[PDB]
């Protein structure tokens, strides 16, 4: 099958940065979610970086800068994935650091394992 590298090259030659992964394989992640609602890898960096200085609960402040479009209310929602907690109501309104996030996860991702309350890779409350 040479159609693989032909498909591999032509995707690299013309496809948008989102539709095609840096290796050249189709990145399904964009195709799995409807419309242009896929959160770019750059956008995730933008949310991580916007969130620490601005802080949680600043979504009214949060929307205005990093995500050029009006982001979905999800910014609260996505953040939970970074913090590995189904209910961020404990962490809300606390400005955090860009490095602090991951430490929060490993504890909760560990706690949810000894609490048997781990589902989908995120601490469920």
């Amino acid at each position: 099958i040479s159609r693989e590298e032909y498909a591999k090259k032509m995707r690299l030659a013309l496809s948008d940065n989102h539709i095609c992964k840096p290796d050249g394989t189709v990145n399904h992640q964009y195709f799995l979610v409807k419309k242009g609602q896929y959160w770019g890898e750059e956008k995730i960096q933008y949310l991580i970086e916007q969130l620490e200085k601005i802080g949680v609960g600043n979504w009214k402040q949060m929307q205005k800068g990093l995500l050029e479009q009006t982001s979905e209310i999800e910014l609260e929602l996505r953040t939970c994935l970074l913090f590995k907690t189904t209910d961020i109501q404990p962490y809300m309104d606390k400005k955090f650091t860009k490095i602090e996030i991951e430490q929060i996860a490993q504890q909760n991702i560990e706690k949810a394992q000894q609490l048997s309350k781990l589902k989908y890779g995120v601490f469920v409350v």
């Binding site: 032509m10 496809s15 948008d16 399904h28 992640q29 195709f31 994935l81 589902k119 469920v124």
Partner: protein, 218 residues
């Protein structure tokens, strides 16, 4: 109806599937799009048809053997003249062209593929089965099928195109209209297997292996 605990219960339930899907996506979950489709999101108004030319010619000594389209006619409203101007002459050197023509534009399309220098020779007919007949309001007759006009140019006398291999009649349902039957690509295979394909104005549900799909909804 006592539903504070109802509406709060669906939220944390719906958030789990997000948490579920957003994990599987990171677990190498496969979308339905095959791994050989060449999807390009663009607007044919602003695309560079020399970037698609220079590339394909390089990553394949050939051009496109079969060209599909289902253009959107104003009746996402693309003007009649701006579709006529798409440089289809240079995308295709030797093969067929498949273009779907609604009845309001059935004559328009025949004019369209002739200015591009082709030669009308056939027409696929896609009748709609109820699951076995369609009801469509036409000004003169009830519409129960859509037509896909077939033009051709160049030397098809090569073994690249299996003659006398597909019919003109198709019997699929009205799946996700406006969506075209998948049986077309199978016919294009029987006509011309393992070849360079192109489908202008396509969507997610049109992606196939070896198909270069252009459409501002991908």
């Amino acid at each position: 109806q006592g539903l504070l605990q109802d509406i709060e219960k669906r939220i944390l339930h719906y958030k789990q599937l997000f948490f579920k899907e957003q994990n599987e996506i990171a677990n190498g979950k496969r979308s339905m799009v095959p791994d050989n489709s060449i999807p390009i999101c663009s607007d044919v108004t602003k695309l560079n048809f020399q970037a698609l030319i220079d590339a394909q010619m390089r990553h394949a000594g050939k051009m496109f053997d079969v060209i599909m389209m289902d253009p959107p006619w104003q009746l996402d409203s693309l003007s009649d003249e701006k579709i006529q101007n798409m440089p289809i002459q240079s995308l295709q050197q030797d093969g067929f062209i498949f273009v779907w023509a609604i009845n309001a534009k059935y004559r328009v399309t025949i004019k369209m593929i002739e200015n591009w220098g082709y030669k009308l020779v056939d027409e696929i007919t896609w009748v709609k089965k109820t699951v076995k007949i369609a009801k469509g309001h036409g000004f003169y007759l009830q519409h129960a099928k859509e037509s896909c006009l077939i033009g051709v140019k160049g030397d098809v006398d090569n073994g690249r195109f299996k003659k006398n291999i597909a019919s003109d009649v198709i019997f699929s349902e009205r799946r996700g209209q406006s969506q075209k039957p998948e049986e077309i690509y199978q016919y294009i295979n029987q006509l011309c297997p393992n070849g360079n394909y192109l489908e202008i104005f396509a969507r997610r549900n049109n992606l196939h292996d070896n198909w270069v799909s252009i459409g501002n909804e991908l």
